[PDB]
Ligand binder design. Structure first.
Ligand code: CHL
Ligand code: CHL
Ligand code: CHL
Ligand code: CHL
Ligand code: CLA
Ligand code: CLA
Ligand code: CLA
Ligand code: CLA
Ligand code: CLA
Ligand SMILES: CC1=C[C@H](O)CC(C)(C)[C@H]1/C=C/C(C)=C/C=C/C(C)=C/C=C/C=C(C)/C=C/C=C(\C)CCC1=C(C)C[C@H](O)CC1(C)C
Lengths: 201, 225, 201
């Protein structure tokens, strides 16, 4: 069996708890997983590198101050910024964020015409035409690789939901919570935190 | 050893005599309808499995509501803090929690329910039963069907199912199930809002009915505003 | 076109996110919308004219005393109560509103027969038999006015949801949150209040 766990891939199955409904729901699922995966690994890396929890990283960069981000990146040869000048600013990045992500979005979904105009079809999660220069889509069992990615997608989203609920309850951070649990698993758990209260009880 | 294969001819210690239906011919005049007898009033019927899921959550929430009720009546400890008693450390306290108990789970001294001991027994018993109920493990009782919430063989030793009308009893259980689940939801929301047990909230609401309500505690912000 | 924004009205096509399901959902959407129109408009007007938050307005009338509600009307020529505080009462307002709203609801749905004795049909929204003393429904484009009503329904409900979550977070009031936003658009928003922790973090 390809998918021995509880649920099954959309292509074949029944979706036991929630009905399958639209196929756009499956499109969203994959995209949510492909995103949350990047989010979870980014929160992991930010906690490991800087010790700053992900959920307050936005406090760092603000309209008045967005210079602190420059010195955070570990092992960089020169800063992010022009040193004292600190050209990077919240708005400086924001205009860049909105234009670049909006272009990437729209050329993905087909709100605007595809610039690549290379036969790629919008509304498919797996293009496999240009976004795989390495050819791992072409080679190997492509369907099995869709399965693995899906599994990683669902795991990462569930871990993301865990991360947000741990940020709400513990207020410490994902990796800080991981270190607390590993240092002592018996007396550092969700139920131990509930016994102590989540800061509200 | 030879094969005897005699006739047991044993009867149930108690076997309820036919009592039929004790309900009106109309069976769900309440909001909504039982599954397999009409259209769901509001929420869409997710799957055929959802009926059995409703039954299981219902029976579990019945048992949970009665447990919180009896625990608070017998000890005064709220159900949501009763977990803090039996822990890997100092699970001795959880023992003497039953009013009138001739003996303690923890005899005086070291003798005691260990959390891990209790836990290990809990996994080995409840998980086994949970699996045997569902398609996991196998079927130790072939005469019964795994995946059926109403087996009604060895699981009704008193034979109320066959003694009365089966389907009215089924809907009666379903109504009790939905009532207890909604009551359980009320209990968790009350625990969140007031930080006091269900019977404590009941007593506060009956001593002075006009105050000690949702909106009275909301006037204080549920202790958060 | 008719519905250029995201999504569509019940007859326009398939729902993007949640499948349409039962036909009664459209009726619930309209009724909820109309109630949210009333709710948002009341929350605005009460906060603008008086200044009390709508969420704490519940505590202001209580069976211990419901005279603070009296005379708290902008430009009120006629007092709500006599000079006597005793005549106005929380249960006096409650009993009449229970009987009036219960009658209105039962007549709208058909639990009890229509006293109006008009062509207005139960299990139906905006019959228009008598609810529109002015015939601009039929004189104007009835379908255009219906889609406009529905767009306002969805806007008012989404705004009410935002209002309740702002009350839970900011605890200052919807209109008061508006005032704070315009007073300082960049230092007063969600992200700034999240940096403050919504009063809990
Ligand atoms: C689009 C995705 C995206 C997401 C999911 C978040 C999510 C977050 N940001 Mg970030 N941001 C995002 C993009 C961006 N942020 C920023 C700049 C900031 C700032 C400046 C701040 C945040 C803050 C926050 C937090 C607000 C919590 C909240 O609203 O209550 C919880 C809400 C939910 C659970 C709703 C679901 C949260 C971790 C704030 C923060 O750290 O608060 C402590 C903060 O001050 N973000 C920029 C630059 C323009 C972004 C660009 O796209
Ligand atoms: C070229 C020298 C240089 C060196 C020795 C390091 C060294 C390090 N960096 Mg840094 N970085 C360097 C340049 C740069 N880093 C960054 C941005 C980052 C990021 C975003 C991350 C690191 C991380 C790391 C660690 C693991 C990287 C592996 O591979 C390590 C301590 C990773 C880390 O510590 O997170 C756990 C990480 O996530 N670096 C940028 C900008 C893109 C650089 C540009 O020159
Ligand atoms: C044999 C004497 C004995 C007596 C008189 C009582 C008397 C009582 N017990 Mg206890 N118990 C006794 C032995 C035991 N009880 C328990 C475990 C419990 C439980 C689990 C519960 C009681 C409950 C009750 C009450 C039920 C009243 C009726 O109905 C009552 C105060 C019930 C209670 O607390 O109701 C609020 C209840 O739920 N008892 C055990 C262990 C199996 C016992 C063993 O000897
Ligand atoms: C039917 C619609 C309706 C709605 C939605 C509300 C909603 C509210 N009322 Mg009101 N009321 C309503 C009708 C009426 N109220 C009152 C009389 C009161 C009183 C006396 C009080 C409220 C309070 C409240 C708040 C309590 C929040 C809560 O339970 O915890 C949160 C629950 C949720 C978010 C639900 C999910 C909230 C703003 C209380 C208040 O203001 O406390 C702050 C309060 O003390 N209401 C009367 C009688 C005339 C009503 C008649 O229909
Ligand atoms: C938002 C992301 C997302 C999306 C769009 C989907 C969509 C889908 N999944 Mg995927 N999945 C997700 C999350 C998601 N899932 C996560 C996190 C897990 C890990 C538990 C899975 C695990 C999973 C399995 C194992 C299976 C699916 C299946 C399916 C399909 C059936 C369900 C459906 O159509 O309704 C989609 C409806 C929703 C996504 C709404 C969910 C609503 C609940 C209430 C969410 C609860 C968490 C919520 C975010 C909490 C709020 C937090 C907030 C307070 C901050 C569909 C294609 C099944 C399938 O393909 O069948 C063939 C299948 O077998 N998925
Ligand atoms: C988890 C328990 C549970 C389950 C599995 C079901 C399942 C079912 N019910 Mg039952 N029911 C329940 C609870 C539940 N109901 C409760 C508590 C009540 C009393 C209010 C009812 C009252 C009821 C009636 C009156 C009827 C049904 C019907 C049905 C069926 C159709 C609905 C469906 O498939 O979608 C199930 C979908 C859901 C359960 C999702 C709803 C989720 C909401 C948001 C509630 C979440 C609760 C809570 C806020 C979570 C807190 C989280 C915590 C972290 C704070 C199905 C068998 C109908 C039927 O049989 O049709 C023929 C019918 O007529 N049920
Ligand atoms: C309770 C109000 C309500 C109701 C009954 C409906 C019902 C409907 N809408 Mg409307 N809609 C609403 C709210 C509502 N919508 C709001 C606020 C918006 C603006 C965001 C819209 C925007 C909208 C669009 C753009 C479209 C619809 C469509 C539809 C249909 C699709 C089926 C559906 O939604 O399932 C019934 C509803 C549910 C199952 C909703 C469950 C709740 C969801 C998952 C999350 C909401 C969060 C919740 C408020 C959190 C509360 C927490 C708080 C208590 C603390 C149906 C007629 C579609 C349509 O007509 O297609 C033909 C369509 O295209 N609606
Ligand atoms: C802005 C929101 C809005 C919109 C666009 C509509 C639009 C419509 N409604 Mg709906 N309706 C709404 C809000 C809305 N309604 C609310 C909040 C309620 C609850 C009271 C109703 C209750 C309702 C019923 C019961 C019926 C309608 C009907 C109609 C149609 C008739 C034409 C009409 O009302 O002109 C809309 C005109 C305007 C939006 C102009 C502005 C009017 C403003 C708000 C001031 C009104 C002052 C008023 C005369 C006196 C009240 C003041 C108080 C102090 C049309 C589809 C009828 C129908 O469709 O039958 C075929 C019908 O039977 N509506
Ligand atoms: C009709 C829609 C509507 C409108 C006009 C506003 C307008 C406003 N909101 Mg509200 N809000 C809304 C919906 C809305 N919100 C919803 C749906 C939510 C829940 C997610 C919130 C949650 C919310 C919080 C927690 C706070 C505001 C705040 C504010 C103010 C600052 C602007 C801002 O950052 O909001 C941003 C809007 C959103 C986050 C809505 C997301 C909708 C998605 C993208 C679709 C402003 C008066 C802040 C305030 O009071 O400022 C002083 C504040 O603390 N709002
Ligand atoms: C379905 C549908 C159809 C209609 O169309 C419309 C509609 C709106 C009615 C809609 C309805 C939806 C809804 C409202 C769903 C809600 C479901 C819910 C709330 C289920 C709850 C299920 C709850 C369980 C199993 C709990 C078991 C509890 C146990 C073991 C406790 C054990 C225990 C005890 C004794 C005391 C110790 O201290 C410790 C612990 C705590 C361990």
């Amino acid at each position: 069996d390809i998918y021995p766990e509880f649920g099954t891939y959309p292509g074949g199955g029944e979706s036991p708890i929630i009905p399958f409904g639209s196929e756009k729901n499956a499109e969203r699922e994959v995209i949510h997983g492909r995103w949350a995966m990047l989010g979870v690994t980014g929160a992991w890396a930010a906690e490991n590198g800087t010790g700053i929890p992900w959920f307050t990283a936005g406090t760092l960069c603000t309209p008045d101050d967005c210079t602190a981000v420059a010195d955070k990146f570990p092992g960089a040869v020169a800063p992010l910024a022009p040193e004292g000048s600190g050209y990077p600013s919240f708005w400086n990045v924001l205009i860049i964020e909105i234009v670049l992500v909006g272009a990437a979005e729209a050329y993905r979904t087909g709100i605007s015409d595809s610039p690549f105009d290379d036969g790629l079809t919008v509304g498919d999660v797996n293009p496999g035409g240009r976004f795989d220069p390495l050819g791992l889509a072409e080679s190997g069992d492509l369907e099995e690789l869709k399965i693995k990615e899906l599994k990683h997608c669902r795991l990462s989203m569930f871990a993301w939901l865990g991360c947000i609920f741990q940020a709400l309850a513990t207020q410490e951070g994902p990796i800080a919570n991981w270190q607390s649990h590993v240092a002592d698993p018996v007396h550092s758990n969700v139920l131990t935190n509930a016994a102590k209260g989540f800061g509200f009880y | 050893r030879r094969t005897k294969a005699s006739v047991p001819a044993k009867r149930s210690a108690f076997k309820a005599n036919k009592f039929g239906s004790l309900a009106p011919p109309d069976l769900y005049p309440e909001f909504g309808t039982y599954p397999g007898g009409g259209e769901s009033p509001v929420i869409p019927f997710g799957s055929e499995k959802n009926a059995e899921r409703e039954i299981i959550h219902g029976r579990w929430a019945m048992l949970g509501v009665t447990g919180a009720w009896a625990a608070e009546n017998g000890t005064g400890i709220p159900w949501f803090t009763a977990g803090t008693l039996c822990t890997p450390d100092d699970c001795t306290a959880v023992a003497d929690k039953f009013p009138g108990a001739v003996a303690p789970l923890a005899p005086a001294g070291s003798g005691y329910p260990n959390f891990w001991a209790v836990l290990a027994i809990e996994i080995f018993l409840v998980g086994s039963a949970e699996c045997y109920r569902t398609g996991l493990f196998e079927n130790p009782f072939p005469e019964l069907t795994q995946g059926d919430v109403t087996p009604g063989g060895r699981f009704d030793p008193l034979g109320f199912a066959e003694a009365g009308d089966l389907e009215e009893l089924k809907i009666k259980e379903l109504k009790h199930s939905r009532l207890a689940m909604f009551a359980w939801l009320g209990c968790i929301m009350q625990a969140l809002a007031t930080q006091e047990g269900p019977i404590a909230n009941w007593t506060a609401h009956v001593a002075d009915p006009i105050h000690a309500n949702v909106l009275t505690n909301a006037a204080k912000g549920f202790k958060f505003y």
